Structures are given as structure tokens and as C-alpha cells.
Amino acid sequence: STGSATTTPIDSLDDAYITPVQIGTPAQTLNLDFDTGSSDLWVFSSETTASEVDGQTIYTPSKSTTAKLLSGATWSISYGDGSSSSGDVYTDTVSVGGLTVTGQAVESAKKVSSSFTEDSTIDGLLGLAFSTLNTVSPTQQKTFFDNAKASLDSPVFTADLGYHAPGTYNFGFIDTTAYTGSITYTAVSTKQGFWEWTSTGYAVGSGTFKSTSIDGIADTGTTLLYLPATVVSAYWAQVSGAKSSSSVGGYVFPCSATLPSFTFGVGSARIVIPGDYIDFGPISTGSSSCFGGIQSSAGIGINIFGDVALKAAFVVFNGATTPTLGFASK
């Protein structure tokens, strides 16, 4: 089997991407944030505290003939941005782009933090990291991809995120029309539960490539590119007037600037992020200070190849017995 679903930016900045997901019988379609940095499929629901729902579409398990309470199971998750959610668990039929999993754990939110409430466009998350990170207790649950894997034509999914445009998540096949050149594959460590890999270096603009190992994670659920402070300083030094602002929370630059590209290495291959992809617009409405799309990871504990980086590439998440990642230009 295979599946193919379009993913759409939630706003004009590509702050996140939503993908429609069918849950239950008859289908209830929710728009979920596919997150290769976490491993829980959770939704706003009929159980979510009413004051914490503001415009989201909810899953109502009582209206699904295939929903079954997973008795005793609870979940609770905190994300790197400080957001969180928690609740109980149902199993139900879940379909993405024509690919159907029966018995998928659907984690129903009883509580969500303010950032989820305040984003009316995201009805929940669909985790695509390794199932060892799943938070369901006392019986850990498998991700949608892990449940679908055995049925897929090939044990892979691909992320093809658009810049200010829709893109595609495919399951079970590699669309050879969706990229240029060849796909370069690179090793993955699953020891932290992430799609963790080592980039071979970077370049700023037309500058020379610096060969250096940068361990990080491929994370579709993070907006920006978070890299070591040395790398990020070298980038922003090429933008007149750019500075790190403790009050804003990162590097800002004059909105009048033209940003240089940023290149990252995948083995001997190179992925070029155009400068425009690094512009996240005014820090506040009407400001002439703009927020940068490359930021320091120094306070995180891990480097994160988020959407800014991934949207410059066609990315293969290879879930074979030894997982790997593939990157191609497009």
C-alpha cells in the first residue's frame, strides 16, 4: 500500500504545516501537524476542556463506530517550545492520503497549553519520530508510520515541504518526479528516538564550504533551523545590522536586508536554503526589525534541522531495519 497527502502552511510565514487526516467511522477529518520530532498522535476532542478549544476541529470518539477506549491508558507530552498536552487514549481507524491503519492509538486531549488553544488551524499532532518516544502509559503505543510499515510497498515516508506553498507527505514510495539529481542517504542514530544524523558542514552565501560535523535532528514540527552558536554567528555576520536580541529571543535583522543563502552538507552533497527562506518577517506588526530563520541551538541541547532547512529539500525518512535519511535538491 501507499498514501499521499498534501500538506499546507498554516500562515504566510510557513510557521507550521497541516495535513488532513481521517479518523473514525464515519470519517472525521482533522488537520494535523505531522511532526518527525515526536511520536504521539493526539487530537483536540470532545474531551478537551472547553475553555481551551478556540476554533479547532475536534474528534468525537462517541460518534465513531470503530472507536474503542484503550482502558487505563493516559498520555502527557511537553515540547521543546514549552507547550504541552495530555489526556486519555482511544484506538480507531486512521487514514492519511488513502493509507489506512486500523487500531491506531488516537490520544484524546483533555488539556492543552495556551499555544495550542491560540492556534485555531492545528487540530492536533501526528508524530513520526521513533515509537520509543511515545508517551502513552502504562502501555507505550506505536506511531502511524510504525503501524503502517509492514503494509507499505517500501518502509519509507517522504517530506516535500513547500516554501510559501503546499507540499506533500508520501508513505510507502519515493516519487522520482519530485526531486532533481540524486538522493544522498546518510546514517541515522535512533538512540534519542529522533531522526538524528550528522551534517558534513555548511557555507554562508557564496562563501567557501566549511567541513565540520554537525549532529542534529530532522524535525518537521520545528519551524526554524537551530545550529551551533559559531555557525549562526558566521551567518548573521554577513547581514548588515543583524544582531542577537535577548529581549526578542534570537537574531533579528533589518527588514530592508537581502539575506544570503545558507548551504548544509549531506555527505558529499549540498542543500542550498535560499535567503528568502530565512526571513520570518517583522518581530511585531509594523516593525522594521525582522526575525531570523536561523537561530542558535545553544539553549536547546540539540541541533534542529527544522522546516527552514527541510523545505529546501526532498527528504526521505527510510524506516528499514537500519534507518537512514535521504536528501535531494528539488
Residues annotated catalytic, as ranges: 35, 199
Please tell me the distance from the alpha carbon of residue 197 to that of residue 313, in angstroms, as a whole number.
15
Please tell me the distance from the alpha carbon of residue 39 to that of residue 41, in angstroms, as a whole number.
7
Torsion of CA 81, 118, 293, 224, to 10 degrees: 40
Please tell me the distance from the alpha carbon of residue 226 to that of residue 285, in angstroms, as a whole number.
24
Tell me if 19 sits within 8 A of 182, measured CB to CB. Answer: no
Please tell me the distance from the alpha carbon of residue 283 to that of residue 250, in angstroms, as a whole number.
10
Alpha-carbon radius of gyration of the chain: 20
Helix (H) or strand (E) holding 231: helix 229-236
Tell me if 19 sits within 8 A of 29, measured CB to CB. Answer: no
Tell me if 172 sits within 8 A of 189, measured CB to CB. Answer: no
- DSSP string computed for 95-132: EETTEEEEEEEEEEEEEE-HHHHT-TT--EEEE-S-GG
Closest C-alpha among 293, 328, 320 to residue 307:
293
Q: What phi and psi, each to the nearest 5 degrees, are found at residue 209?
A: -75, 130
Closest C-alpha among 193, 234, 181 to residue 36:
193
Q: What phi and psi, each to the nearest 5 degrees, are found at residue 197?
A: -145, 175
Closest C-alpha among 3, 27, 6, 29 to residue 17:
6
